[PDB]
Ligand binder design. Structure first.
Ligand SMILES: Nc1ncnc2c1ncn2[C@@H]1O[C@H](COP(=O)(O)OP(=O)(O)OP(=O)(O)O)[C@@H](O)[C@H]1O
Ligand SMILES: [Mg+2]
Lengths: 242, 149, 109, 72, 261, 242, 71, 249, 196
């Protein structure tokens, strides 16, 4: 019928144009993210950009703290970002409540994936236009990255990037794990993994950075933290002295 | 940026440390190394325009170091560090490196010292492909002559 | 009888051996006929690398005999890449042999 | 000027040749335009721009004083 | 309507990009020999209106001084048929005896039309003239020192065989002037006018966006009317600050929405 | 026909609905929020449409709980609904946790509520921009809330028709005082820049409203400016613009 | 075959991207990369040049590999 | 307010329900999977694919466990497969493991899942899941059994079958390859050989997901000293095993 | 059962025993009652074991969500949660909870919540059924703002008299120290405090 794509219904090609369109709204902030696995840590960086000075820079964020061990990095519009953040925090509380231990990242990936599926099966839900990266350090699975997308599909990774120009970053990561011959960087301090990540980002995007142009989130064991600008500056200085 | 306070502060410092330069300059007679540190901290700028100004204070200072017959070794290491420190506005540093080579021609050093300093300097800009290139070729042919004999 | 059971990429090899038979019977009118059929059975993309190396080899020799040394050199360059860099069980002898033909092709030009 | 299956492509060719001589290849600086039109929501985006009709005057519905004048 | 290398300010990066296609193979084909590519040719210009896409066309004919023709989209259209084919066939010929020629199609939407011909006969007239171009652009007739600069005000009007690369190899978009790209445009237009002395634009312009490059020169014209009202001969920042309000106001009368590849 | 509903997407990343709501907001009057060191100062332009009105008898600034001022532009009845909703949520928090709601928490709540109206065919997205802020115990904060369900931190925010002028003037005010100013001193500034934002609007006459929530002068409660103070601010602006 | 490349450049990183191209656009990208090469001022095509040229006039699809969830 | 309670699925004028037609087209868009029923077991095999080569595929599954005797494998949409596996486990426990305290026969479960598909075809506010599932299992009364549930909500029992985009060719191959007596070993070799015609990409045990409903494993039971209960008849083969069988072709 | 909390200079010290009787039978003599519901805001339960534990679970739930959305809650806030849970289930559930927590700004604080549900801020709180015997001992010898050593010996002696006179109280004495430095457990066996 004339409506195949104002509601979630297959096309004559056997398809969902609507969900496609969701994927075509993940590149509007044009933020890029890069996430790699250390040996005992997980590191993720994202861009920060403010179009005006009259914003306060602190509040502009894309790294959202969901659990105490799971960080969430969002690619796509910020309204949907906030709705997703709220969803996830609810589910985390509820897992702790019903099973007696904090939510694993894997379980969260899947819970959020199924909610996604439900938004693309009900004829009056609009799907989220956000790709979520879940970074964690598990004690049963180790440092892990799970990526879910508006489809409700998710997959694991050794490393991954997101954004409009994230192919460049894919090249970088590919070559890096080509030389290393192993699925994670062998580094025993989270600092140097931040450093490596920023190096690959400068190479990939072709542009140098500053403390107010970055945003860094680190998942160590049994915690998650974000660095402030002051600590990011120090990483940048130690890059030049490699 | 999100504040204009770094702007007001950085520019203003530049003017005032000209007033304090004669004080620094007499202090270098007692110990150059301490005066060197004072100007090095000065050059830490988060505002673009003040970079150009603060590098001029160091140029006058290092003439004393360059002329010396032990301390120019220490000078070559510094130039390295400056490009690395932050990048610090790709215009400022590129003007400095030139003015130093220009000084070297006029200070009149040993064949040997001239040779070894230049290799250290062309080495820095091998890792660069910006304005450096203009100067890099010119000092390269200056070095050609040295080995020609 | 295995052409009604045409599902296998191992019928590539049979075409190639037939091409070789006419080759040393020293007629290339029929050598090409059986080559074309080999390329057809190898149009399936599920054939191993090794058998495709064989495919280029046979053409390399054959257009060499027809005295075109532009085609022969391109075909021998392709087969050198296959033999040299995958494992050797007879591919040490077949990388050597392809190499010598590459050198020969250029002397004729 | 996105037309689908109609003779509107014949119409617009006197729109386009207008925009061409409303560009300077001088000997149009002294040549002006006034234009009257009933509605101003039907114009082409190449007539929003300045260089074609730079000043844009609206005719308002009458006022108290204005109405009195007109009758007189 | 001539102007120097610089026909805009702050969009210089696109000016540099254009000469890559045009000016570079003009001077040295030999640097495109080293690479081994086909010598660049073919340019589509598309963007929002009034953004100096045409003024740049006049500038690259002026600056280089290479042989230029031109064509308005609708002065090559004729009543006689086989006559509107004649010009453009014979215009390419001209281009092969005249050195390094540059063919500016100005504001083409006339024969930009698609296959239509379920409408009037005019749509087959378009068709006849369109087929003529393709055979020229690529065939045994191949160019190399004949370049196409195609100027249009919306590119999704066109037929996709006029979106075809290797006839159009580079598709340069010039956007609307940017936050400080207006600033760069303002400093060239405050030299032309008489001014008290004004280097206080910066805040007002960025937060009076809505201007194309031709409206910046309409802020100066409208500021010269506020001046005339005061009986001044100079552009004041009193006159300028009332002007940016007015000029922005009159453009909100109708909108414009355009999307691109 | 992707302009028909909010739950539709388009292949341009656009959801035409929500963009159109911004044009409803562009129809409102100037409204400014000045973030000062001590608190926040709101001001609203109140058009006097006729000589039959009762002056200073209609408020467009309404308080929620007692320490969060809310001032909105766009559709006055619609924004009115939004403020009512936010008071319900505020009282809920206050009952459940025994403390007046923090300003960031408030921000979460209202953002979610407006984000909700784009996920269902059943509803229409609100066409209002809100500016809300105040003093809590973790300091003064300011937020501007989009009809899109987006918001950020701000050192100065504005909306309305004379937003052009106001934004520029605020840029200057942060260039005069990069370390900020007093909420006492900001009364006069709100007067100033509303007056400057009425030359784009100089068809009419208007009344100035100012209100503020600062720790140093109202003890952290949202009160209105009046009397000799209000009239002095008026006179200040008046002399500046003449 | 016609043009120079660098040993850093590869033609096998072009399969993974889009899987519906025309022969003219492949003659187009390589020509567009030969202009970016002169902005570096280099006569050998680097893989930096070659991926940037792919990114312009890319004509992206949501039917091709590395863009799917229908698997 | 909400009024999506009218079906989005209707009869077409030419007689058919258009939406299952579109869904069945969507199934020929996905990955390829097949299942062979041997005399002494069942083997199911599928391809692992990911968006990027740097994505993990060991933390991802296309052969899922519904019960220790019953596995499923899909061709079609991932997201649709995921939720529906969970629902299958769900109704398997609430309506056979609370009412008889034990796991369901293969067939019973097949019908349990066919209803969920059916109510995705009925009842406005839904569209069909765009998957075909193979439900392979073993029950103690009809032995080994292989079923296919389609987007429509019907099922069919098969002796061997394939789903996905390479289905026409695969089925023609299995036409000769099937025999009245087949050994589970021989069926393993056969399934690999067929799905090799179907797969272009690198061929290892790390990309071919193999599972067998073969025979019971007392070592996967997790306890001993009970002879009455026996181990899972399902087993997922990790990559090591499968790498031997690449070589045993 | 005996629980108390006493504030001191630098924070607060929480104190409990571990004897848990049903009837005459002690179910476990090494039972914990010093519970964490946040990472700085600990509680002492007494009353019905089932009731206290259930309530504690739900309050942990709410506080954890509070942390994820709004930043960490204050001792005040947690106490309010407990209050509002008691007030809805006062007719069915029997709980006495002492909520003691370290605020970085103000210091350790002690609120007590009876079973009807009300908040009372106090400089020191006691509850249980071994606590009606040590009221006077506490009240006479208490001063505001003692040193850490003092606080520890104080709570030790108070809980020794509680253990003496109440037979539902006993086992080891356990303590949690909430300060800026962190969280420290102390444990005192019977041989240790009988001598004194
Ligand atoms: N960036 C500019 N700075 C100064 N003047 C400009 C600028 N661009 C355009 N103009 C002015 O606008 C006039 C007309 O614009 P022009 O014809 O060059 O532009 P255009 O972008 O193609 O749009 P159209 O073709 O519809 O006119 C010029 O004659 C010139 O006075
Ligand atoms: Mg024009």
């Amino acid at each position: 019928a004339g409506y195949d794509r104002h509601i979630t219904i297959f096309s004559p090609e056997g398809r969902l144009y609507q969900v496609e369109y969701a994927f075509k709204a993940t590149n509007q902030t044009n933020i890029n993210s890069l996430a790699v696995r250390g040996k005992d840590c997980t590191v993720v960086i994202s861009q920060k950009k403010v179009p005006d000075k009259l914003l306060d820079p602190t509040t502009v964020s894309y790294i959202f703290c969901i659990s105490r061990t799971i960080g969430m990095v969002v690619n796509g519009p910020i309204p949907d970002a906030r709705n997703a953040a709220l969803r996830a925090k609810a589910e985390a509380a509820e897992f702790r409540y019903k099973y007696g231990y904090d939510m694993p990242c894997d379980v969260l990936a899947k819970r959020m994936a199924n909610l996604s599926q439900i938004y693309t099966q009900r004829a009056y839900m609009r799907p989220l236009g956000v790709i979520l990266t879940f970074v964690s350090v598990d004690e049963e699975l180790g440092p892990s990255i799970y990526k879910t997308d508006p489809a409700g599909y998710y997959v694991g990774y050794k490393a991954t990037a997101t954004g409009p120009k994230q192919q460049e970053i894919t090249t970088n990561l590919e070559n890096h794990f080509k030389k290393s011959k192993i699925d994670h960087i062998n580094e025993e301090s989270w600092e140097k993994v931040v450093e490596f990540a920023i190096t690959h980002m400068i190479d990939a995007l072709g542009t140098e950075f500053s403390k107010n142009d970055l945003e860094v989130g680190v998942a160590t064991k049994d915690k998650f933290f974000t660095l402030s600008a002051e600590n990011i500056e120090e990483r940048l200085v130690a890059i030049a002295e490699q | 940026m999100s504040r204009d306070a770094p702007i007001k502060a950085d520019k203003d410092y530049s003017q005032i440390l000209k007033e304090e330069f004669p004080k620094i300059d007499s202090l270098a007679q007692n110990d150059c190394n301490s005066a060197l540190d004072q100007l090095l901290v000065l050059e830490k700028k988060t505002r673009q325009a003040s970079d150009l100004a603060s590098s001029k204070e160091v140029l006058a200072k290092i003439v004393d170091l360059l002329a010396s017959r032990n301390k120019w070794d220490d000078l070559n290491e510094q130039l390295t560090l400056l490009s690395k420190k932050h990048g610090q506005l790709k215009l400022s540093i590129q003007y400095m490196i030139q003015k130093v080579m220009e000084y070297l021609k006029s200070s009149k050093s040993l064949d040997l010292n001239t040779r070894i300093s230049v290799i250290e300097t062309i080495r820095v800009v091998t890792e660069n492909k910006i304005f450096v290139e203009v100067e890099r070729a010119r000092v390269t042919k200056d070095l050609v002559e040295i080995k020609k004999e | 009888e295995f052409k009604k059971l045409d599902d296998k990429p191992s019928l590539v090899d049979v075409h190639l051996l037939e091409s070789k038979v006419y080759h040393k019977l020293r007629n290339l009118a029929k050598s090409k006929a059986s080559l074309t059929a080999a390329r057809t059975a190898a149009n399936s993309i599920y054939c191993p690398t090794q058998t495709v190396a064989e495919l280029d080899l046979m053409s390399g020799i054959l257009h060499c005999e027809d005295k075109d040394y532009k085609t022969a050199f391109s075909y021998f360059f392709e087969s050198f890449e296959s033999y040299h860099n995958l494992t050797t069980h007879n591919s040490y002898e077949k990388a050597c042999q392809v190499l010598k033909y590459m050198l020969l092709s250029k002397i004729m030009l | 000027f996105d037309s689908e299956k109609s003779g509107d492509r014949e119409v617009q060719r006197t729109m386009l040749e207008l925009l061409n001589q409303l560009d300077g290849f001088s000997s149009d600086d002294r040549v002006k335009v006034l234009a009257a039109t009933n509605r101003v929501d039907v114009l082409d985006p190449a007539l929003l721009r300045s260089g074609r009709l730079d000043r844009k005057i609206e005719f308002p519905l009458p006022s108290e004083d204005s109405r009195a004048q007109i009758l007189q | 309507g001539e102007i120097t290398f610089d026909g805009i300010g702050g969009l210089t990066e696109q000016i540099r990009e254009l000469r890559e296609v045009i000016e570079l193979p003009l001077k040295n084909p030999e640097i495109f020999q080293r690479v081994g590519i086909k010598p660049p040719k073919g340019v589509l210009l598309y963007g929002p209106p009034g953004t100096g896409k045409t003024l740049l066309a006049k500038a690259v004919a002026a600056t280089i001084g290479a042989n230029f023709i031109f064509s308005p989209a609708s002065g090559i259209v004729d009543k006689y048929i086989g006559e509107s084919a004649r010009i453009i066939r014979e215009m390419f010929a001209y281009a092969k005896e005249h050195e390094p020629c540059i063919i500016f199609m100005d504001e083409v939407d006339a024969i930009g039309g698609r296959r239509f011909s379920e409408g009037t006969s005019a749509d087959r007239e378009i068709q006849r003239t369109l087929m003529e171009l393709l055979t020229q652009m690529d065939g045994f007739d191949n160019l190399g020192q004949t370049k196409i600069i195609m100027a249009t005000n919306r590119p999704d009007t066109l037929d996709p065989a006029l979106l075809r690369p290797g006839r159009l190899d580079r598709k340069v978009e010039i956007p609307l002037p940017n936050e400080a790209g207006r600033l760069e445009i303002f400093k060239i237009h405050t030299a032309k006018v008489k001014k008290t002395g004004e280097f206080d634009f910066e805040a007002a312009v960025k937060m009076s966006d809505g201007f194309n490059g031709a409206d910046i020169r309409n802020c100066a014209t409208e500021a010269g009317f506020f001046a005339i009202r005061d009986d001044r001969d100079h552009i004041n920042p009193d006159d300028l600050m009332k002007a940016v309000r007015k000029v922005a106001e009159v453009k909100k009368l109708e909108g414009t929405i355009e999307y691109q590849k | 026909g992707y302009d028909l509903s909010n739950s539709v997407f388009s292949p341009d990343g656009r959801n035409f609905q929500v963009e159109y709501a911004v044009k409803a907001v562009e129809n409102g009057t100037t409204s400014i929020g000045i973030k000062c060191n001590d608190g926040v100062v709101f001001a609203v332009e109140k058009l006097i449409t006729s000589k039959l009105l009762v002056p200073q008898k209609n408020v467009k600034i309404q308080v929620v709980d007692r320490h969060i001022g809310c001032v909105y532009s766009g559709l006055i009845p619609d924004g009115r609904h939004l403020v009512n909703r936010g008071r319900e949520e505020a009282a809920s928090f206050k009952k459940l946790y025994k403390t007046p709601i923090p300003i960031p928490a408030f921000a979460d709540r209202l953002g979610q509520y407006v984000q909700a109206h784009t996920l269902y065919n059943s509803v229409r997205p609100f066409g209002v921009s809100t500016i809300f802020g105040g003093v809590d115990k973790n300091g003064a904060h300011l937020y501007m809330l989009e009809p899109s369900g987006s918001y950020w931190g701000y050192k100065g925010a504005a909306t309305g028709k004379g937003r052009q002028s106001a934004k520029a003037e605020l840029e200057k005010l942060v260039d005069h005082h990069p370390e900020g100013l007093s909420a006492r001193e900001a009364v006069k500034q709100a007067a100033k820049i509303i007056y400057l934002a009425h030359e784009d609007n100089k068809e009419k006459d208007f009344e100035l409203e100012i209100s503020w929530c600062s720790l140093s002068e109202t003890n952290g409660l949202h009160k209105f400016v009046k009397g000799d103070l209000l009239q002095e601010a008026i006179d200040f602006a008046q002399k500046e613009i003449n | 075959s016609k043009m120079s490349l660098a040993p850093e450049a590869d033609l096998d990183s072009l399969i993974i991207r889009n899987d519906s191209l025309s022969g003219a656009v492949i003659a187009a990208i390589m020509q567009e990369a030969g202009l970016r090469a002169v902005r570096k001022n280099r006569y050998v095509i680097l893989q930096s040049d070659l991926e940037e040229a792919y990114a312009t006039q890319v004509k992206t699809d949501n039917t091709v590999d590395k863009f799917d969830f229908y698997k | 307010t909400d009024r999506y309670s009218f079906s989005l699925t209707t009869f077409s004028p030419s007689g058919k329900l258009g939406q299952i037609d579109y869904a069945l087209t969507a199934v020929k868009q996905g990955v390829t999977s097949l299942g062979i029923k041997a005399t002494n077991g069942v083997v199911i095999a599928t391809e692992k694919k990911s968006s990027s080569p740097l994505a993990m595929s060991e933390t991802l599954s296309k052969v899922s466990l519904l019960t220790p005797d019953i596995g499923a494998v899909y061709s079609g949409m991932g997201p649709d497969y995921r939720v529906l596996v969970d629902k299958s486990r769900k109704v398997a426990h609430t309506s056979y493991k609370r009412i008889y305290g034990e796991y369901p026969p293969t067939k019973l479960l097949v019908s349990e899942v066919a209803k969920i598909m059916q109510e995705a075809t009925q009842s406005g506010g839904v569209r069909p899941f765009g998957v075909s599932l193979l439900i392979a299992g073993h029950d103690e009364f009809n032995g080994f059994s292989l079923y296919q549930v389609d987007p429509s909500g019907s099922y069919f029992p098969w002796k061997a079958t394939a789903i996905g985009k390479g289905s026409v060719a695969a089925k023609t191959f299995l036409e000769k390859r099937w025999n009245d007596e087949l050994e589970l070993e021989d069926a393993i070799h056969i399934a690999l050989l067929t799905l090799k015609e179907s797969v272009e990409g690198e061929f290892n045990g790390d990309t071919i997901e193999l599972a067998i409903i073969g025979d019971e494993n007392p070592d996967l039971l997790g306890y001993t000293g009970i002879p009455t209960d026996k181990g899972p008849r399902f087993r997922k083969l990790t990559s090591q095993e499968i790498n031997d069988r690449l070589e045993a072709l | 059962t005996s629980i108390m909390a006493v504030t001191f200079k630098d924070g607060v010290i929480l104190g409990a025993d571990s004897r848990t009787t049903t009837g005459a039978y002690i179910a476990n003599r090494v039972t914990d009652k010093l519970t964490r519901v946040h990472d700085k805001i600990w509680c002492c339960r007494s009353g019905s074991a089932a009731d206290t534990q259930a309530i504690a679970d739900i309050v942990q739930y709410h506080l954890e969500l509070y942390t994820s959305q709004y930043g960490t809650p204050s001792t005040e806030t947690a106490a309010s949660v407990f209050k509002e849970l008691c007030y809805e289930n006062k007719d069915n559930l029997t709980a006495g909870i002492i909520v003691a927590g370290y605020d970085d700004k103000n210091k350790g604080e002690v609120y007590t919540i009876p079973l009807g549900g009300s908040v009372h801020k106090l400089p020191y709180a006691i509850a249980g059924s071994g606590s009606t015997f040590i009221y006077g001992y506490c009240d006479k010898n208490f001063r505001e703002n003692m040193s850490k050593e003092e606080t520890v010996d104080f709570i030790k002696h108070s809980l020794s008299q509680a253990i003496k006179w109440d037979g539902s109280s006993g086992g080891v004495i356990r303590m949690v120290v909430l300060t800026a430095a962190g969280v420290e457990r102390l444990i005192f066996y019977p041989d240790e405090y009988e001598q004194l």
